[PDB]
Design a protein around this ligand. Structure first.
Ligand code: BCL
Ligand code: BCL
Ligand code: BCL
Ligand code: BCL
Ligand SMILES: CC[C@H]1c2cc3[nH]c4c(c3C)C(=O)[C@H](C(=O)OC)c4c3nc(cc4[nH]c(cc(n2)[C@@H]1C)c(C(C)=O)c4C)[C@@H](C)[C@@H]3CCC(=O)OC/C=C(\C)CCC[C@H](C)CCC[C@H](C)CCCC(C)C
Ligand SMILES: CC[C@H]1c2cc3[nH]c4c(c3C)C(=O)[C@H](C(=O)OC)c4c3nc(cc4[nH]c(cc(n2)[C@@H]1C)c(C(C)=O)c4C)[C@@H](C)[C@@H]3CCC(=O)OC/C=C(\C)CCC[C@H](C)CCC[C@H](C)CCCC(C)C
Ligand SMILES: COC1=C(OC)C(=O)C(C/C=C(\C)CC/C=C(\C)CC/C=C(\C)CC/C=C(\C)CC/C=C(\C)CC/C=C(\C)CC/C=C(/C)CC/C=C(\C)CC/C=C(\C)CCC=C(C)C)=C(C)C1=O
Ligand SMILES: [Fe+3]
Lengths: 302, 281, 240
């Protein structure tokens, strides 16, 4: 093979790039970390710097609180035994309050009360992180494409954990915190709602999930195959179309009868991925609230 | 017929087979010998479904389903109406898929670019063959493969999965899923990043690749780079499909039981498989 | 039934979304042209998108797309058939005329800049203080062509400073002068650099840069295009 380009053959190293300044508060940026030769074979070797901000600190903290709340409960179920803790690590589960308590926050800690506390910390950690992704883009004067795409993922997580259980009138409809347990929750959910496979939004989400692995494999391979013309420098290819962009476009034009541009492909990319969590959230939202059985609902197509 | 910059690239040469006999275009489509072959395999395959739909008696697509031979037929030939068509269609499908990849290779040579695309596509072909060839042969019957129907093949997935309890517990399964999710994650991030730099805030100039690196380093403390992310995206998608085929080639072959019980080589260790308390104890 | 309503509404959105994406991807290469240069009659069921403006950094002007496009370069090709769909044969030397796999586009004859306004690509000798951190150092190594003959030696590496990545090997020819080779088109071995794409006497044919310390976008494509074209056009020179 005259041409791998999956891993670099030669690594070069110079002074650390402190990055663009613009309107970011440099006082909240860390120092640069060490260089990683291991990472250097695949991508950049430079580690750091990182930006905090007020939201970032709040996010990490509220995040860490979400773990310990789950962590302590896991230790509790293991009878404070370190061995039994690591034996049943994947079997531990922090479950939501029983149906008895409905939508009340008046559940005791050992009966779903802790789950409510954990979910609260996760809620703050995620949304504060979302604002962080927004503000980092704004501070650099960049577009907000990242936050809006992130918002699609949040939407799915909000439906599963908050929006749908409220509509169902019970917190027990929410997702538990535990490796194996929510897998069982996921399987049981599909069984309860009469085989999810016949949920059209569910099939759509799968189509986009597949399509995401499809599109990127095509795009990633395309860029690498065109790397010999410096095709990975996409932004300058936008401002000034190169022979890199042209050969890449013609390959697909000749393959499938039509093609994309260096910018438009990233619009294809961002929508393909977003539609996964976007459609999925809708499909879950309608399940149990509007439709009890999707197969039966499907056979009448109405 | 031509893109504004296309003419200077449409030159002769690059073909693997047939020389200059099939070296031409039909509209935007390039032909080549494998283009003819692809069309040939596709033509026959589509015809076969039509004759399968006639025997089935319906013509709406959402009920049309071409089933493989029954398990009793083993790995032998079957009558057309009883799984034979499926076998021939599969032969045509495999012929159509492989021909498509080789046609892409011819296009790669004429454009003087790398062979990454058909190489990546080969993984998709591998996954299909895993379900229709490798696994059925290792289990000793074509009937273990999935039917060619929009909803019936969904049932095949539903039936096959539950046969081994909860298919979530397959370890090669979890890995494949994790890559599928991570791939969608990276695709969204890469698309958003490029577009946000090329289309900044109103009243702002177009940003540089330095801004892209800076954004993610401000965000998570590291950016992989323009070249590395396309390397990553390819790897994630290929790995997702690789373990996908892997999670199916080992089920019903070297593993026959419920995947729930796989996790015993951690739980029932002779250190803690007796200590009271906990979920299991 | 509300469930039916939601899915019917989404398909409308999806169809409109597809329409939006396709037109947005017609900002380059369109309108379609006939093989004689004249605009094609059938432009497809999707219309040209209304213009879009980019404000280029470092005061390098603006870009409006789509707009009237030119190659701004002569194309040395001849039509093979009266009818549509047949290849165009080179009238001269395809590598030198820049057609086929050896094609290059008329980008601006200026170097790409980083975020700070400095040249994105510069030789390692002029980049304090870059050095080889891993892999085989190619400096001083002999460069060999597909004809298994030494064409020269690597004297320097041209690195992508913001990305800290090697992009070009600078190869010194027999006449003392140097040429740039794409890092993706070479294979560095323990005691030599192997170039599959070119024979030893085709190294001199590589386009030259006008400055010893910088390379422009136009020069890069000329180099990259030429080297990639050697895979098809240097096939006659074999050795068994
Ligand atoms: C991978 C593991 C399972 C499987 C599990 C599932 C599940 C689970 C789902 C699907 C769904 C679909 N599957 Mg399936 N599927 C498998 C193997 C296949 C193969 C194959 C030859 O390997 C094909 C062609 C398909 C095709 C399809 C589509 C009809 C549909 C959307 C996929 C999509 O958009 O992907 C991404 C690809 C693209 C975006 C590119 C365009 C692809 C087009 C849309 C495919 C149309 C196929 C067409 C009917 C086949 C040819 C007919 C001839 C032209 C006459 N499946 C195997 C057996 N598949 C979903 C569905 O039924 O939704 C209603 C769904 O929920
Ligand atoms: C027997 C089980 C059921 C089934 C039950 C369900 C249910 C129930 C659901 C899915 C869902 C999904 N299923 Mg299904 N599924 C089955 C069979 C399949 C098959 C198949 C070939 O058989 C496929 C391909 C899929 C594929 C998929 C996806 C299309 C979809 C999830 C999108 C996603 O990215 O989620 C992963 C992404 C997220 C959850 C978003 C998370 C966003 C937040 C902000 C992340 C916070 C992170 C936190 C701060 C830090 C975490 C760190 C980590 C812990 C390390 N399923 C069968 C029929 N499936 C979901 C869906 O949308 O359905 C409509 C869903 O809820
Ligand atoms: C989408 C439908 C189901 C679901 C079904 C599955 C299935 C099925 C699988 C996972 C798997 C995983 N899930 Mg889950 N999962 C859901 C919602 C979640 C939520 C959430 C925000 O509520 C979180 C934090 C997780 C977290 C995780 C990880 C522990 C793991 C790998 C994810 C990954 O690659 O991420 C991307 C990677 C990074 C961000 C790093 N899931 C919903 C409820 N999840 C896999 C696993 O390993 O399970 C043990 C797996 O097989
Ligand atoms: C109740 C059902 C079971 C279950 C049963 C199964 C079974 C059984 C299998 C999977 C498989 C998979 N499942 Mg599972 N699965 C479940 C739950 C899940 C969940 C979840 C959220 O819980 C997730 C995320 C998944 C995800 C996945 C993937 C790991 C994998 C599918 C991708 C793949 O292999 O593509 C592989 C890609 C291809 C086959 C693509 C082939 C493409 C061809 C070449 C296209 C040709 C062109 C086409 C004809 C063109 C038409 C053009 C015209 C113009 C229309 N499953 C539950 C527990 N799942 C499958 C797998 O691993 O397969 C290997 C599989 O067989
Ligand atoms: C287009 C849809 C896809 C999507 C979108 C998306 N997600 C995003 C983004 C986007 C566009 C971001 O910008 C944002 C980001 O910052 O990315 C770098 C994010 C993000 N997507 C994330 C995760 C994630 N996304 C997922 C899915 C998807 N996200 C979809 C496929 C999944 C799943 C389940 O598949 C996960 C797990 C985060 C990396 C990040 C949001 C950051 C955040 O919320 O931070 C606050 C949280 C913390 C400080 C805690 C961090 C937790 C650690 C990673 C550890 C987890 C350990 C585990 C729970 C251990 C359990 C056992 C122990 C107790 C023993
Ligand atoms: C890395 C693996 C991932 C991947 C990537 C990938 N796919 C690829 C490529 C790449 C890199 C291509 O270059 C090539 C392409 O051009 O893609 C747009 C291809 C391709 N990926 C395709 C689709 C596709 N990829 C899928 C999956 C994946 N693609 C993986 C996730 C799926 C799924 C999940 O089901 C589908 C449907 C096509 C668009 C294209 C290959 C086109 C092709 O094969 O053309 C020749 C064949 C025909 C024109 C028709 C043949 C018809 C048969 C003779 C009869 C019908 C057979 C069929 C099985 C009947 C049953 C259908 C029912 C199950 C619905
Ligand atoms: C700039 O880069 C870009 C990127 O990167 C940076 C990208 O990543 C991508 C990639 C991104 C995308 C593709 C966009 C997103 C789209 C997707 C998510 C992918 C999904 C794709 C689809 C759903 C489309 C599916 C593709 C199809 C349908 C392929 C169509 C196939 C056929 C119809 C058959 C193929 C036809 C062939 C092979 C030839 C026809 C066969 C024949 C034999 C023709 C008959 C010939 C004759 C009659 C005889 C010949 C006649 C003669 C000789 C004439 C005689 C002379 C006379 C004068 C008479 C792109 C495009 C890109 O641009
Ligand atoms: Fe890209």
């Amino acid at each position: 093979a005259e041409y791998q380009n999956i891993f670099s053959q030669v690594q070069v190293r110079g002074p650390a790039d402190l990055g663009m300044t613009e309107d970011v508060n440099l006082a909240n940026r860390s120092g640069v970390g060490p260089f990683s030769t291991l990472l250097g074979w695949f991508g950049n070797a430079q580690l750091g710097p990182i930006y905090l901000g007020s939201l970032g600190v709040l996010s990490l903290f509220s995040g860490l609180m979400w773990f310990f709340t789950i962590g302590i409960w896991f230790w509790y179920q293991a009878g404070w035994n370190p061995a039994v803790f690591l034996r049943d690590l994947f079997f531990f589960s922090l479950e939501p309050p029983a149906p008895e308590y409905g939508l009340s926050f008046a559940a005791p800690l050992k009966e779903g009360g802790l789950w409510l506390i954990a979910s609260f910390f996760m809620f703050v950690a995620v949304w504060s992180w979302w604002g962080r992704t927004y503000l980092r883009a704004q501070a650099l004067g960049m577009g907000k494409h990242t936050a809006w795409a992130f918002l699609s993922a949040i939407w799915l997580w909000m439906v599963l954990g908050f929006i749908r259980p409220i509509l169902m009138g019970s917190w027990s409809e929410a997702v538990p915190y535990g490796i194996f347990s929510h897998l069982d929750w996921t399987n049981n959910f599909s069984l309860v709602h009469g085989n999810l496979f016949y949920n059209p939004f569910h099939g759509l989400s799968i189509a986009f999930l597949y399509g995401s692995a499809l599109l990127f494999a095509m795009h990633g391979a395309t860029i690498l195959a065109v790397s010999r013309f410096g095709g990975e420098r996409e932004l300058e290819q936008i401002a000034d179309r190169g022979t890199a962009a042209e050969r890449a476009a013609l390959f697909w034009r000749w393959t499938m009868g039509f093609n994309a541009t260096m910018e438009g492909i990233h619009r294809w990319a961002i929508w393909m991925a977003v539609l996964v969590t976007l459609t999925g959230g809708i499909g879950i939202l309608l399940s149990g609230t509007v439709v009890d059985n999707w197969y039966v609902w499907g056979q009448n197509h109405g | 017929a031509l893109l504004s910059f296309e003419r200077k690239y449409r030159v002769p040469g690059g073909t693997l087979v047939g020389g200059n006999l099939f070296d031409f275009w039909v509209g935007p489509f390039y032909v080549g010998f494998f283009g003819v072959a692809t069309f040939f395999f596709a033509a026959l395959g589509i015809i076969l479904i039509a004759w399968s739909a006639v025997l089935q008696g319906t013509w709406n697509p959402q009920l049309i389903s071409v089933y493989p031979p029954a398990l009793e037929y083993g790995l032998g030939g079957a009558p057309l109406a009883k799984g034979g068509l499926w076998q021939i269609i599969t032969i045509c499908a495999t012929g159509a898929f492989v021909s498509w990849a080789l046609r892409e290779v011819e296009i790669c040579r004429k454009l003087g670019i790398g062979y990454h695309i058909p190489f990546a596509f080969a993984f998709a072909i591998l996954a299909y063959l895993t379900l229709v060839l490798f696994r059925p042969v290792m289990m000793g019957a074509w009937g273990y493969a999935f039917p060619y129907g929009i909803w019936t093949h969904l049932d095949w997935v539903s039936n096959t999965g539950y046969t081994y309890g909860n298919f979530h517990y397959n370890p090669a399964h979890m890995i494949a899923i994790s890559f599928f999710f991570t791939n969608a994650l990276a695709l969204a991030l890469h698309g958003a990043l490029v577009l946000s730099a090329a289309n900044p805030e109103k009243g702002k100039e177009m940003r540089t690749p330095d801004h892209e690196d800076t954004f993610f380093r401000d965000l998570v403390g590291y950016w992989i780079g323009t070249l590395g992310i396309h390397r990553l995206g390819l790897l994630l998608s290929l790995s997702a499909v690789f373990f996908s085929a892997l999670c199916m080639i080992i089920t019903g072959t070297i593993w026959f039981d419920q995947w729930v019980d796989w996790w015993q080589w951690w739980v029932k260790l002779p250190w803690w498989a007796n200590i009271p308390g906990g979920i299991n104890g | 039934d509300l469930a039916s309503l939601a899915i019917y509404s989404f398909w409308i959105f999806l169809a409109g979304l597809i329409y939006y994406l396709q037109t947005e991807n017609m900002r380059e290469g369109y309108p379609l042209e006939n093989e004689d240069g004249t605009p094609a009659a059938n432009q497809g069921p999707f219309p040209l998108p209304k213009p879009k403006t980019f404000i280029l950094p470092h005061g390098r002007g603006t870009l409006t797309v789509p707009g009237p496009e030119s190659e701004d370069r002569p194309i040395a090709l001849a039509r093979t058939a009266v009818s549509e769909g047949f290849p165009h044969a080179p009238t001269g030397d395809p590598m030198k005329d820049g057609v086929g796999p050896a094609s290059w586009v008329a980008r601006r004859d200026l170097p790409e800049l980083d975020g700070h306004g400095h040249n994105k690509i510069k030789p390692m000798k002029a980049a304090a203080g870059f050095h080889v951190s891993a892999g085989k150092n190619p400096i001083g190594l002999p460069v060999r062509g597909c004809d298994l003959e030494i064409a020269g030696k690597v004297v320097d590496i041209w690195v992508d400073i913001p990305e800290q990545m090697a992009r070009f090997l600078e190869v010194e020819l027999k006449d003392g002068s140097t040429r740039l080779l794409p890092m993706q088109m070479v294979k560095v071995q323990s005691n030599r650099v192997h170039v599959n794409a070119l024979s030893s006497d085709l190294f001199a044919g590589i386009p030259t840069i006008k400055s010893p310390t910088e390379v422009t976008l136009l020069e890069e494509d000329k180099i990259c295009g030429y080297v990639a074209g050697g895979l098809m056009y240097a096939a006659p020179k074999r050795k068994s």
